[PDB]
A paper describes a structure:
Aggrecan (ACAN) is a large, secreted chondroitin sulfate proteoglycan that includes three globular regions named G1, G2, G3, and is decorated with multiple glycosaminoglycan attachments between its G2 and G3 domains. The N-terminal G1 region interacts with the glycosaminoglycan hyaluronan (HA), which is an essential component of the vertebrate extracellular matrix. ACAN is a large, secreted glycoprotein that spans more than 2500 amino acids in humans. Its N-terminus includes a globular region named G1 that shares ∼39% amino acid identity with HAPLN1 and is composed of an immunoglobulin (Ig) domain and two Link modules. We demonstrate that the single immunoglobulin domain and the two Link modules that comprise the G1 region form a single structural unit, and that HA is clamped inside a groove that spans the length of the tandem Link domains.
The structure of deglycosylated ACAN(G1) was solved by molecular replacement using a model generated by AlphaFold and refined to 3.50 Å (Rwork/Rfree = 0.247/0.284). There are two molecules of ACAN in the crystal asymmetric unit. Overall, these three discrete domains form a single structural unit that resembles an inverted letter “L” with dimensions of ∼ 60 × 50 × 20 Å. The interface between the Ig domain and Link-1 buries 430 Å2, while the interface between Link-1 and Link-2 buries 682 Å2. The two protomers in the asymmetric unit superimpose with an RMSD of 1.25 Å over 251 Cα pairs. However, examination of the two protein chains suggests that there are significant differences in the arrangement of loop regions in the Link domains between the two protomers. Specifically, although continuous electron density in chain A made it possible to build the entire Link tandem repeats, two segments in the Link domains of chain B could not be built because of missing or uninterpretable electron density. These segments include amino acids 216 to 240 and 257 to 260. Furthermore, the conformation of the region 307 to 339 in chain A differs significantly from the one adopted in chain B. The conformation of this segment in chain A may be an artifact of crystallization because the single GlcNAc attached at N333 is wedged between the Link-1 and Link-2 domains.
Author numbering: 29 to 56, 71 to 350
């Protein structure tokens, strides 16, 4: 029997959107969809004789849309794409003693990050929240993107605007003053549709980044103006928050503090990368505190985080 996935290998899809992997087989039967992510492989579903049995974790998430209406079409559909769903998907068709397989890499692009232009909380109406997202090399995040970010581990007890004019915030362990509409249950708390002129923070979605982000330093660091002038001296400019988080997502160790474009300094952190300046290999991390952001005096001395 023959199996084919007619799609170029680096299949790129956005965060929170859907995914369709075409898989067609010829049998001169049982279908299995699995996914290898780094070192872990997860069986997504197994179909046979018209019935599909789906992984419990991927319930209402993966499906075979054209099966069994077209019994020779093992096309897979994956909904609500979190950045975890990246990896190499395997479509394997087996009959009796024969079996064939095909693979396809999926790269879920984009990252959802918080923005608050100054240390003052909740200062952006809907329009100016969108403007802040635009000025930080991003768009205003859709609620699906924020849901995927929460499913990936994002948590911040700060209400922020979204694309659908709603104001939400994700939380895994409910805290005092952070329960919202989910009681003491985890989830993405929402305030519903709000008036276009209510002030909150913003949740932005940074999709892609064509240039590169790097640290420009000096023996005495830089004041903010010196950092901007150092970036401009190298034919570059101070990286925005979206560019910073896109570089940090791509694997660049941006944990060290440095001047960003908006006179702010962020310390990106996660459960996988909780340390800075090194790593503690004999220790695993379960919980990690929310991302920290300082709005230092313009005279403070840091590295420059330039983008080119
Ligand atoms: C920090 O922000 C990044 C990007 O917004 C996110 O992926 C990460 O989960 C955040 N960390 C925490 C602990 O919320
Ligand atoms: C990613 O997905 C795998 C398989 O579903 C799961 O075991 C793992 O905990 C997830 N990790 C993150 C960081 O989302
Ligand atoms: C916002 O707009 C509404 C209706 O357009 C108006 O009544 C209200 O005064 C405005 N400001 C605030 C803070 O709600």
């Amino acid at each position: 029997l023959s199996v084919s996935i007619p799609q170029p290998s680096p299949l790129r899809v956005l965060l929170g959107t859907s995914l369709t992997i075409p898989c067609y087989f010829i049998d001169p039967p049982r279908i299995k969809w699995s996914r290898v992510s780094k070192e872990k492989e997860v069986v997504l579903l197994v179909a046979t004789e018209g019935r599909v049995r789906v992984n419990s974790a991927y319930q209402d998430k993966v499906s075979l849309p054209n099966y069994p209406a077209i019994p020779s079409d093992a096309t897979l559909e994956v909904q609500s794409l979190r950045s975890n769903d990246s990896g190499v998907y395997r479509c394997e068709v087996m009959h009796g003693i024969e079996d064939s397989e095909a693979t396809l890499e999926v790269v879920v692009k984009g990252i959802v990050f918080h923005y608050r232009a100054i240390s003052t909380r909740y200062t952006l109406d809907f329009d100016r929240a969108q403007r802040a997202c635009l000025q930080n090399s991003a768009i205003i995040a859709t609620p699906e993107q924020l849901q995927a970010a929460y499913e990936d581990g994002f948590h911040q007890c700060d209400a922020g605007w979204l694309a659908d004019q709603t104001v939400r915030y994700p939380i895994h362990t409910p805290r005092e003053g952070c329960y919202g509409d989910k009681d003491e249950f985890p989830g993405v708390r929402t305030y519903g549709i709000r008036d276009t002129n209510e002030t909150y923070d913003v949740y932005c979605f940074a999709e892609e980044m064509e240039g590169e982000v790097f640290y420009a330093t000096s023996p005495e660091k830089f004041t903010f103006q010196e950092a901007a002038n150092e970036c401009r001296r190298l034919g570059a400019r101070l990286a925005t928050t979206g560019q910073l988080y896109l570089a940090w997502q791509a694997g660049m160790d941006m944990c060290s503090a440095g001047w960003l474009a908006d006179r702010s300094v962020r310390y990106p952190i996660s459960k996988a990368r909780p340390n800075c300046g090194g790593n503690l290999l004999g220790v695993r991390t379960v919980y990690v505190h929310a991302n920290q952001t300082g709005y230092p005096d313009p005279s403070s001395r840091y590295d420059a985080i330039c983008y080119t």
